[model samples]
Target chain A: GGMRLVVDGFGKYLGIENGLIVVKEKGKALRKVRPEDLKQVLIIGKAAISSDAIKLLLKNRVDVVFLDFNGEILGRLSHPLIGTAKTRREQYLAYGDKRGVHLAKEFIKAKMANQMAILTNLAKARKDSNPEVAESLLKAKKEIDACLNELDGVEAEMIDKVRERLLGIEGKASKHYWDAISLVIPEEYRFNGRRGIEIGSPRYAKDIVNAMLNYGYSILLAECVKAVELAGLDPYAGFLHVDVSGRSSLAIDLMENFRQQVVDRVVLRLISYRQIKPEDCEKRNMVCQLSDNARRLLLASLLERLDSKTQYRGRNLAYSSIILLHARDVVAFLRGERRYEGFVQK
Target chain B: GGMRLVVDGFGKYLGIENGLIVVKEKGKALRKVRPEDLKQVLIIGKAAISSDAIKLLLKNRVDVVFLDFNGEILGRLSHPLIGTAKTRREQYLAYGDKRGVHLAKEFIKAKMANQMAILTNLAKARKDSNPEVAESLLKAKKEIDACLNELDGVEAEMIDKVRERLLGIEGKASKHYWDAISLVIPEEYRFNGRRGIEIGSPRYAKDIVNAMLNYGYSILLAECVKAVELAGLDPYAGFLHVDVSGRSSLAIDLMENFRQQVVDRVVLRLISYRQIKPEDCEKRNMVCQLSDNARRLLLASLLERLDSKTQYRGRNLAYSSIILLHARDVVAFLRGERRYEGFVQKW
Candidate 1:
């Protein structure tokens, strides 16, 4: 049986029955594993996987995690657990600290930038002389602006309050996008009142967000994990984001700014390019996917953006490198090797 | 186990079966029998079905198929017995006189209309100010037209003649679209030597065709299926298009004219408005997907065309309805129910 183990991350055991655990670089490799023996599988690849696999893993009790290339987990999969009184207390105290307050501000800036980028693209598209183009883009821009305003006023130093503020912001953003999407629905899309069951239209926003979340969260965690590794800081301790259960709170802290930079950037570029169309937004067979063509387009773009280099802190660095460096710095702070200087978008 | 049945057109069961069967009917009470003594159970449900009972039936190997919906089995699913000389001979004698010529011609016309529509749409989308909208419509149009032109000179009749024409046409068109897609190739999409690995940028021509192809094909098929139903014809039987493994050849035939009206019309509107732009065409992903926002603009227009009422044969019908009427009339010719007529585009 194969086992996926980490000192601070969630424990995964696959092939526990077969005694031949398999950890793969890509998901296609999992085909060789028998269904019965698949115990814990960590999907370290930051690509959108077929929903079929996710369902199968859930059914089989396998740990289907979304991870980055740097061997850091982004989204987690596990059974629920109770937290000790002392553990919960440390989480609250940490969030109330000066460092937690610092990271919260950076998170807001990154998210704000992302919303602006979307708004700018929408305005450009809406400039079309065509009535339909103008109308659709107009609705799209309004929704993006709503998300932008949500993060405008927030107390960064108070981690609990900041975390509460983000929850409200993210919720409003989801509603805003969903509302814009409802208008100008495609012809083939029939509404029988079942939620999210779009028949023909490409749910471009849904796909981009999903893809963004997968890649964005991975970049965020990777940066956090790297900081932990560099500073010998325990990734287990985190502030602002929730700390209970087997989750990487420190990586959450690290991901604050870059989530907007990497994921949102890639997503907006895709939508602006019309790489995804109505068909890509279709909900089919109880599963939602960008059309095969749309998926290919988004995947290629995300990789390109990741490869695109940018100046982050003076020295030339790949966007991917910046992520790793910031993650490493987070670790440095936790280990008391350096003060926690959260990433700020220059 | 249920056995396959080769039944005649009259709904007479040829009694071919080695499989379990169940049938239910609409607006009729169940004629109850002992659950254990049911001999190859047949429960027929017409227009209405209970969701709760249907879910329970899925658990067993018992087959559940609707009657008028019966044509889907014939249309969407292909059978090997379709093109064999033995089957053709059997069918030819079964129907009094030879009608093969009429059937073959109808199929070709349908196919031709679909390609023409795509081509016209591509030409129109080229002027779209939004690069992505113009490019996708243009690419789809080119691919379809190129395929049609390949078949133009070939005076092919009969299924075999047309099938050969299609193979060569589809292959050539694939190459053409792939070529246009090669420009502005993304570095990540650069060759990995893996199968089904798509890469490359879209050429001006290919961009329009590609866009139209993505939109046109879906509309064409869905509409064709509808026309097949409305016409009361067996959608499965066809000539010209090959009755290969699993294909809706008739649906393929019906997609023709609708493609032009739906796809071409949308492309023209986008161009007239100058919504599609050349700048949007700058390659991002290796494959030429319209920029995300431009694509939404294009899709919105295309969707409107499907529902838009227009003149067809001096009658007001949704562009989608005309496609259906055309499909039925063709079927009528084969059965000697109506005279065969060629489709001419209306201005």
Candidate 2:
């Protein structure tokens, strides 16, 4: 692993000095880094860099990420070397074959199963302590299990052939999963539905839970994009998600298998454990937004989740490593060398 | 057209101020231009620019090209938006169909015919005044015509199926054309043969003619890269050339259609008219490179030809505009809209 750079300054300068990356402010040097020693760079809000420095970073295949003040990903500056022709050729070919449908089902199956485990595992722990909440969670888990059964029956050669059924099944599971998740959260942070997930409407979240999830998933999506690109896969060519121009459908598709553990669980723990409160959200014209304090807490918890290691194929791998490993497996599977098994949380 | 900027200096700086590109030298501002007004930017040597300026250029889909002192292109900074998925999709798909064969033959056919046209037109000029040179050019012109007749027999649904045959025919015509071209050049500047064309070995050019051709072709390749990318084509996924990694094959493929008129014709006149002499080349360690003065004259002549207008689809268009138009026609042809008619230059 190389050094991951994080520069959140308002007016810091990044340039090349003596064949190293130098950080400057007010026309004086502050820090220097060898381009080879760096892995990733994160630019937050109004930071400037030199073309020579960025060219050095890209020459070494280091990706630079830009995020806005609210931690929304603006775009990434990546080298064109990431576009490996073999992997991209197979990725596009797989979309019109049975391989596309197989991966789509696996992604949804892993997600729904992970959702069920989150509820049942909590219910089992609380059955001896609080019987009512445990039974309610079990009942909601059963509804999601039925959604999974419906997903198993829908099959097609290409993902596009049965995309509506997949979306409908995923939607049913989401409704029950979010409704049951509220029982575990602190009462004040509960919300009616997944507001931003669909409708693209003008409605805003009146609670903190939706805001936290939105912010956290945005960060998770950046990680998935990096992992997919690192594995030489095209983020815009997707199997489960519709391939739309200017959208990274594959990264969002890969984000599905871990959203429960990586984002939802972290948000639930932060809110339920009183690390974040309902009033921590700032209200601006009927829209609830994460306060500066709440944003920091959520990001810290998200990083902690990413750093956590779990059993993956009988070996302990960090959450970030697992995401990268699964992405590589997709390439291998598409190349006719390996099988792609989805990841699930413990 | 946006402002085409060229900054050639040692340690000159290009930064952003007030959302405009500012050229700085020794803590003093030299020039500034709004990002919206910039069409293309070229850096000569040892220049530094801020990433903010690069991001701004890329956001507006402006490409920045960097060239070394020898005028060899190092790399280019372009927006990822240039990778238009729809056009690329059709390009890769076309490689496996009859469309690939059609374009591949058209490229070679256009180049060989242009070679014949150069000889024929020059032969007519010397027919009355110098009949000896005119008769020699006519003989070589017939040899190339025979090569073209052989090319007409090559038929395949995919380019790869007939690539070897195409290369063989093109190779025969190249030998005849180059031999014929030497007849028009000064005897001292003529070479034994085209040495740098193949055998990627440790051999270097021993003549100024080959050296000039190499330098001029490099610049022409850069222009072809910008044109092909503008039409949203993958420069690596080529039809005539093999699809090798790290090679811009499609750009080189497009280069074949114009090399005779754009580079060869210009190099011939500069040598024949005594503008460039035998000693206008630098020799060091078995390598013949362009002298500084020769480079400036060659670049000026090349740009003049690029800016000159010619007939294209019943309309007169500049060479640069025609290159762009032909590139866009490739995209439209692949997407099944228009038939691709290759460009041919007149004397």
What's the lDDT for all of these models?
A: 0.44, 0.77
lDDT of 1 by residue, B1-347 (tens): 22211111111111101222222222222233222232122111112122222222232322222222111221111101111222323223322333544444444554455444444444454465546645664676566565656555545334454556555564455454344333222333332221231112213222533443454454446557556644544344444443333244456555544654576556545654557654444364553445544555665565457657777667876665567677656655655677755455634
lDDT score for residue B296 of model 1 = 50
Model 2 TM-score is 0.76
TM-score of chain B of each: 0.47, 0.89
Model 1 spans > 4 angstroms off: A1-93, A121-158, A169-236, A243-247, A272-274, A277-285, A290-297, A329-346, B1-347
> Candidate 1 residues A154-192, lDDT tens each?
556567656766756755664554454333233344321
Task: Give the per-residue lDDT of model 2 (tens digit) for A1-346.
Answer: 5666766544565667788888776668888889899877776555655455667777787777766545655567666552365677778788888888888888888889889988987799789898998999999999999999998898798888998789789889988988888777756666666776411232456788888877887888888988897787777777776633445678878888888989988987786678888889798667788887788678778877987888878898889999999899899889999977777755
Candidate number achieving the greatest lDDT relative to the actual structure: 2
lDDT of 1: 0.44
**What CA root-mean-square deviation does each model show from the true structure?**
31.3, 5.5
DockQ-based class of model 1 = incorrect
Q: Candidate 2, residue A261: CA error in Å?
A: 3.9
Q: Return the TM-scores of chain A for each candidate in numbered order.
A: 0.51, 0.88
